[PDB]
Amino acid sequence: PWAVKPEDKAKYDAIFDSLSPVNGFLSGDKVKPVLLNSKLPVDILGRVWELSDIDHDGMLDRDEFAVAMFLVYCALEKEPVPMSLPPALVPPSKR
């Protein structure tokens, strides 16, 4: 299944749409601050964004911004983040 659920991606879509989405995408200029707010270093956001950037277009779409929300909230109370976009984090749009 998808590492992220509908309730976990539902809150991600609110933070993703709280920065002003463009055609379904957020520029690091909207996410960077979203990740810099997790009290984590740019090493987690520099790596959480990448694994979050499913298209590598310099933005986090509703599905990409989702993978970067649990990757940031887990580095605060759960564990760090690896740099290998796991296949369990890919949304259905990448099927």
């Binding site: 690091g28 200029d29 960077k32 990740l35 810099l36 740019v42 090493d43 956001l45 520099g46 964004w49 990448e50 950037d53 590598h56 310099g58």
Partner: peptide, 6 residues
């Protein structure tokens, strides 16, 4: 270039 964090 990319990833505006690092």
């Amino acid at each position: 270039s990319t990833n505006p964090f690092r």
